[PDB]
Amino acid sequence: NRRRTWTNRPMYRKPRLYRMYRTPDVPKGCEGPCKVQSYEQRHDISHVGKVLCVSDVTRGNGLTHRVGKRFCVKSVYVLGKIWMDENIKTKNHTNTVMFYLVRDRRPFGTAMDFGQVFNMYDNEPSTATIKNDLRDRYQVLRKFTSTVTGGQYASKEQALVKKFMKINNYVVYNHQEAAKYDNHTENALLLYMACTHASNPVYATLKIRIYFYDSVQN
Amino acid sequence: RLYRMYRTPDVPKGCEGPCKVQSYEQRHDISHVGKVLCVSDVTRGNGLTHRVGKRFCVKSVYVLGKIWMDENIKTKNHTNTVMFYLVRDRRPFGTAMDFGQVFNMYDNEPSTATIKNDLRDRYQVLRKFTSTVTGGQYASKEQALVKKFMKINNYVVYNHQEAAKYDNHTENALLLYMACTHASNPVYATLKIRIYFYDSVQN
Amino acid sequence: RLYRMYRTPDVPKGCEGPCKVQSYEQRHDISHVGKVLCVSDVTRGNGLTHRVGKRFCVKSVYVLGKIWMDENIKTKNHTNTVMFYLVRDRRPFGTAMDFGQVFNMYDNEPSTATIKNDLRDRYQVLRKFTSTVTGGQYASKEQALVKKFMKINNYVVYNHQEAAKYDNHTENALLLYMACTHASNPVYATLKIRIYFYDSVQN
Amino acid sequence: NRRRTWTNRPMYRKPRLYRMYRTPDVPKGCEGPCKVQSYEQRHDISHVGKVLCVSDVTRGNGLTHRVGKRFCVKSVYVLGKIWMDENIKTKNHTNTVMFYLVRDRRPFGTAMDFGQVFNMYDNEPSTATIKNDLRDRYQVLRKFTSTVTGGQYASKEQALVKKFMKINNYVVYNHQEAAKYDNHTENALLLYMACTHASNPVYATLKIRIYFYDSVQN
DNA sequence: CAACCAC
DNA sequence: CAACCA
DNA sequence: CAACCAC
DNA sequence: CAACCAC
DNA sequence: CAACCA
DNA sequence: CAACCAC
């Protein structure tokens, strides 16, 4: 019944039920089924830092597709593992991976890059807050850490990241669809990752999942 | 006269009789690819720890035991976590599908595991829980205790046929899925998986 | 008067109109795990090489091209065969399932591949055909030609929706599954997969 | 419809339809759906030779289960690959794998073993026929070969075996079910494999599939 | 509380 | 509770 | 929630 | 025959 | 045709 | 079919 109605739907549009009615699940303005979108990747983290846009969703009929240019992201579910490489783990040290889920109210360009948005002493991600000028544009919705420790004879090779986070965030795109950061006219959810230890890196195998609904507004 | 049978508290709705247990005591050899076992496997019969009809409600699962490392593996310095998933298959068939072909994930990594985008209507994850164990030459955390009681009102329907097999389940079959986070070396899991069920008043 | 339309020979039953072609020209990078592509992917529209309704009959598939080895791989002495399977998925959904999770086989070996015991009702193998290529330092068989016409009366039903996507197919979707027999090194396959179809008289 | 009737069948017995009626597919005497049974294995072949029983099927309600002690094997489908190991393939030589699908009308014991049934000069599998005395007991239903050639600079590492073969063969078991060669009261289908080259071995990754129907007779 | 068993 | 699916 | 910024 | 196009 | 399934 | 043996 769940699956049938979506396949047997009228050509270009959602099933009638969705159009009609509203679950308590869906936020204000927006309608339709809770569409998912996933970013599965092994991110190689550094001291300088890494970025990715997690609102990157293309436009289309089906599921995992925005319909219009506007849509509301209701929640983000980051899950996976951060870990040390087999040659690095021998060396005795510790590193926390700093995750910052930020929003930029006025986005453009390809990517902002870490340390060109976060102000910090000696390029240190633990002392990181938004820059004086960009403070208006960028806001940190969530931040969360994850520790990993190397050692010759005894090591903590890996750490499991599992973090659900609800953030009712409305985003607006261009007319053209590419599922790219460049296309976002309104705010776009960015995940910024940074390794606390200066020299050696850490890996982060992550599924970043994002849950969203299509906007009726405008 | 005929009074209605006052079903006692702490039995599920549409179910009666004594609470019947069913145990699956085993040493599971856990891997990165992932192990499976069906925990709704219970035979039909007049004996105790058998179902009577085709319908019954599991009220609660009790997983208890130990995860541990072998004597040659424990010397090697690493960490690894066993990822328990108790999942419900709503509309099952055939052999129980392997951890790899139910859960989708990056590089066969169980920490990134969620139910496949295609067959998400079919399977649901009821409970998940981790358990970490650390190797080390001079200082190891050889073992880790598992003690996990979980109340789930799961009504399984069976095939007409009598057998304690997965093929028989018509709907809501219970699978326990296990997987080790570290790729190379394995882990043992000595586990008693106990299940507490009541037979349905219907049929 | 109204005479019935004498449908010409060499069009399928319940189908009429001109025979429309559809091509999928590509260099496929073949592996041991196995590659897939849907060959019933055709969009809805008034243009040529589009379907009109949701129903149409593929009458014939024409696979032609070349399997070949890279300049660094061809020096290494081995043999490897590409195993083409043209399979029908009767009742499809979602993303097209990977070669590994449709076909069951010993040690992921495509030569031992048959459709999984569970989902055997769903998938059928219409045609299979091999193509061997041999490496060698001094004397190699670098490449192998593929030329294979196959008449299959396959009636696909689509989703209401217009799109040339696999998700849309309601039934009888056509998948071409490819897999290399040798485990280590890969093979290229420059292929034109052409498909010859007629639109259904119904709807 | 196909799948539903088998799951919704009456408890201990086949669907009514099968009981009633007979397809042209099923052989004489026997009834019911065409039950399959598979033996997927990497067989390590030698000059002395290897054996396996391919009628090994256990007893039970479902598919891939015999019901009674009697059943008819209609066809065998051997498919897979024979191949040379990475260190062996360097050496220049040739070997054919000789497959013999034989039937022993009066089987017992664990396995007969190759060269204790086949008579041959200098233990050579190419000169192999059934022994003078056992000739009555054993019959070769099919034989088929497959060549593989080693070489330092140019080799034929592997060869694809694909062989369907129809052989309406009725077999009878003990009362007890173990899916073992020992249990066969009547004839059992045995596959005998042998490498033609004396010294080095060859591997054989094979799915041996067998198609059978349950007997109404006796 | 521990885990279908009791107080 | 797990993570849009019941 | 994170930290004077915004929803 | 080659592969929706023709003789 | 592929291999018990349409 | 394989090779005096059997179905």
Topology, pairings included?
The structure is cut from a larger assembly and holds 2 copies of chain A (218 residues) and 2 copies of chain B (203 residues).
Chain A: H1 2-7, H2 16-20, E1 31-45, E2 50-53, E3 70-83, E4 93-104, E5 118-119, E6 129-130, E7 138-150, E8 158-172, E9 188-195, E10 202-214
Antiparallel strand pairs in A: 1-10, 2-9, 3-8, 3-10, 4-7, 4-9, 5-6
Chain B: E1 15-30, E2 35-38, E3 55-68, E4 79-89, H1 99-102, E5 103-104, E6 114-115, E7 123-134, E8 143-157, E9 173-178, E10 187-200
Chain A binds 6 DNA strands through residues 2, 25, 33-36, 74-75, 77, 79, 103, 105, 129-130, 135-143, 164-165, 167-170, 209, 211.
Could you write a compact summary of the structure shown?
With 218 residues, chain A is mainly β.
Describe the protein in words.
This is part of a larger assembly, with two copies of chain A (218 residues) and two copies of chain B (203 residues). Chain A has helices at 2-7, 16-20, and strands spanning 31-45, 50-53, 70-83, 93-104, 118-119, 129-130, 138-150, 158-172, 188-195, 202-214. With 218 residues, chain A is mainly β. In chain A, strands 1-10-3-8 form a four-stranded antiparallel beta sheet, with no helix packed on it. Chain B is mostly beta strands and 203 residues long. Chain B has a single domain, classed as Jelly Rolls. Helix content of chain B is 2%, strand content 47%. Chain B is elongated. Chain B starts with 14 loop residues before the first strand and ends with a strand. Chain A binds six DNA strands through strand 1, strand 3, strand 6, strand 7 and strand 8. Chains B, C: It comes from Ageratum yellow vein virus. Chains B, C: It is found in: Host nucleus; Virion. Chains B, C: Keywords: Capsid protein, DNA-binding, Host nucleus, Metal-binding, T=1 icosahedral capsid protein, Viral penetration into host nucleus, Virion, Virus entry into host cell, Zinc, Zinc-finger. Chains B, C: Binds the genomic viral ssDNA and shuttles it into and out of the cell nucleus.
